[PDB]
Design a binder for this molecule. Sequence first.
Ligand SMILES: Nc1ncnc2c1ncn2[C@@H]1O[C@H](COP(=O)(O)OP(=O)(O)O)[C@@H](O)[C@H]1O
Ligand SMILES: Nc1ncnc2c1ncn2[C@@H]1O[C@H](COP(=O)(O)OP(=O)(O)O)[C@@H](O)[C@H]1O
Ligand SMILES: [Ca+2]
Ligand SMILES: [Ca+2]
Lengths: 193, 192
Amino acid sequence: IAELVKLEERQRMARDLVDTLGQKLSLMGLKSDLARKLIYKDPEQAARELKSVQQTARTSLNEVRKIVSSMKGIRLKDELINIKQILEAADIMFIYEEEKWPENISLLNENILSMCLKEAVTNVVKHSQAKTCRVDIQQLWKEVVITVSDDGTFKGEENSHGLLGMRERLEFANGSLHIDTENGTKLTMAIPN
Amino acid sequence: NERIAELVKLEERQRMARDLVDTLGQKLSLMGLKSDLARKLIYKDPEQAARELKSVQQTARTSLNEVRKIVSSMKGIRLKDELINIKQILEAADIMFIYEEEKWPENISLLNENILSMCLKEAVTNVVKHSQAKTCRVDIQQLWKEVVITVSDDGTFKGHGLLGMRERLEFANGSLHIDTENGTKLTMAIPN
Ligand SMILES: Nc1ncnc2c1ncn2[C@@H]1O[C@H](COP(=O)(O)OP(=O)(O)O)[C@@H](O)[C@H]1O
Ligand SMILES: Nc1ncnc2c1ncn2[C@@H]1O[C@H](COP(=O)(O)OP(=O)(O)O)[C@@H](O)[C@H]1O
Ligand SMILES: [Ca+2]
Ligand SMILES: [Ca+2]
C-alpha cells in the first residue's frame, strides 16, 4: 500500500521516543528522591536538584514536541547530500573521505545529528569566509562522531540561536559538543550509538 | 491486499506506540510541575514538599511499570476480547452473566482498552474466587467524557488485585469505587 510501508520507520521513531522518555522519567524519579532526602539537610542543594529535574523535563518535552505528529525526522544520509549542495552553492569546497557508515543508529539520533550537521554547515556559510569545509562522520566504538572543520576565521566572542541549540539537543541524547576556534572552527559532535 | 492486511497490524501497533509517547509525556510534564511546586515549598512547608516528591516518585514507578509490559509487542488486550473471555469464565463458574449490549465506546485509546481489560479481568476473577455469587452483571458505558465499566455481583464481600486495579486506573487518570452494601459493585472509570 506504500503509504503504510512508511509506517515502519514511523514505528521505529515512536519506539525511540518511548525509550528516551522512559529514561528521562526514570532519571527525574531518581533526582526527585535524592532531592526529597536533602530537604532538611541541605535545602539549597535540594532546590538545585529540582531545578535540574525541571530542566530535564522542559528540554525533553522540547525535543520530542516537534517529532510527535509525523513521527519523522531527518535522515543523516539525506542531510549529508544536503550540506554538500549548500557548500557548493556557497563556493566552499566540501571535503569528505567516506569511511564505514554508522550502522545501528536510532532514528531519533539521526535526526539530532542531522540538525547539528545542518546548523554547523549553515554557520560555515554565514560566518566563516572559509575556503574549505571538511565533514568527518566516524563510527567510533560505542559512539558516532561528526567533525565539521572550516578554514575560515571564528567571529564570535565567548558565547555558547545555533550553538546553544546544538549543545542542548546533543546533551539530551547524552552526547556532547566541542568547539575549537584557534585556526578556523572545528565543531566535534559525539552521540551514543 | 495480501500485504495490506498485515500492514494494518503495524497500524494498530503504531497507535499503541503513540499512546505510550503521549502518556509518558503527560507524566513527565506532571512530574515537572510537581517538582517545581515542591521546590517553591522547601522553606515555607518542607512537609508538603516531601509529599509532593513522594508522589513524583510514585508516578515515575507506576508509569514505567505500566509501559514495561506493552513496549516490546506494542500490543495490549482489546476490550471486546476480554468481554468474551469473562463470559466464558462466568459460564465455567456457573455464575449467571448479565450483560445488556449498548453503544460501544467510540474512541478509546489502545492503552486504555488494555487497562480496562485488565481491571475487568481482575474484577470477574475476584467474583469467581471470592463472592460466592449466582449472578454477575457487567455494564460498559460511554458516559460524556469517560468510559465506565461496572461489575456487580450478588455474593458477599469478604475483605494484589484491588490495589493493582486502583493504581492502573489512577495512572489513566480515572478511578475505582467499591460498594459492598448489597453484594460487591466495582465501578471503574477512565477519561475518554
Ligand atoms: N563556523 C563558524 N565560523 C566563524 N564564526 C562562527 C562559526 N559558527 C559560529 N560562529 C560565531 O558564533 C556566533 C554564534 O553562532 P550561532 O549560535 O549560530 O548564532 P547566529 O548564527 O544566529 O549568530 C555567530 O554569530 C558567529 O559570530
Ligand atoms: N467480588 C468479591 N467478592 C467478595 N470479596 C471480594 C471480592 N473482591 C475482592 N474481595 C475481597 O478483597 C480481598 C482483596 O482482593 P484482591 O485485592 O483481589 O486480593 P486476593 O484476590 O489476592 O485476596 C479478597 O481476598 C476478598 O477478601
Ligand atoms: Ca547560526
Ligand atoms: Ca484477586
